Amino acid sequence: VNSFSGYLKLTDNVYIKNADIVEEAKKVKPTVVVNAANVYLKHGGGVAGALNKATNNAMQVESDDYIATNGPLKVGGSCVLSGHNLAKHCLHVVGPNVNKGEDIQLLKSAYENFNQHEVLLAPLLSAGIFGADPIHSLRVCVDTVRTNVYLAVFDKNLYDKLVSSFL
Ligand SMILES: CC[C@H](CO)Nc1ncnc2[nH]ccc12
Ligand SMILES: [Cl-]
């Protein structure tokens, strides 16, 4: 039993809700919130910009030190950093950005990072401003993640399409 509320159950382990991931994280304070990151951990817009803003830019400051030490992530890769005021940890995961020409096949590799954590609050990887088909992202999530994932879909209209079209 966990403190996530109002989710629709899609499979044994995948749940979904129309919600703002920032407001969800502040309410639940999950062990792990997933950020839709880029390789430079530059949290400018989309989910990343919103999460970072909610941390008063502390996420960006921590991220800049991480990059200065370790260099960029790989597309499909991840790193664990602080969750600041939002969660215990933030798992920064880089899905392929179609608006940069990156290989959508890397989306499965990106979701594999979730399997290292028993429970996660997450957005749909490569959706929104990353330019991939969200229906496809949800399918890859369900077919790749085996741990317990609580998906927050910001756009109510898109949420309804994802539910109604889910196989
Ligand atoms: C990734 C595509 C979805 C479509 O809604 N984007 C989001 N989902 C949940 N929380 C969010 N916070 C800011 C953006 C955002
Ligand atoms: Cl987005």
Curated annotation (Swiss-Prot):
Q: Where in the cell is it found?
A: Host endoplasmic reticulum membrane
Ways its activity is controlled: Inhibited in vitro by GRL-0617.
Quote the catalytic activity from the record: Thiol-dependent hydrolysis of ester, thioester, amide, peptide and isopeptide bonds formed by the C-terminal Gly of ubiquitin (a 76-residue protein attached to proteins as an intracellular targeting signal)
What is the membrane topology listed in the Swiss-Prot or TrEMBL record? Multi-pass membrane protein
Per UniProt, residues of the Macro domain are 1-167
What's this protein's function?
Responsible for the cleavages located at the N-terminus of the replicase polyprotein. Participates together with nsp4 in the assembly of virally-induced cytoplasmic double-membrane vesicles necessary for viral replication. Antagonizes innate immune induction of type I interferon by blocking the phosphorylation, dimerization and subsequent nuclear translocation of host IRF3. Also prevents host NF-kappa-B signaling. In addition, PL-PRO possesses a deubiquitinating/deISGylating activity and processes both 'Lys-48'- and 'Lys-63'-linked polyubiquitin chains from cellular substrates.
Subunit structure, per the record? Answer: May form homohexamers. Interacts with N protein.
What is the name attached to this protein's record?
A: Papain-like protease nsp3
Organism placement in taxonomy: Viruses, Riboviria, Orthornavirae, Pisuviricota, Pisoniviricetes
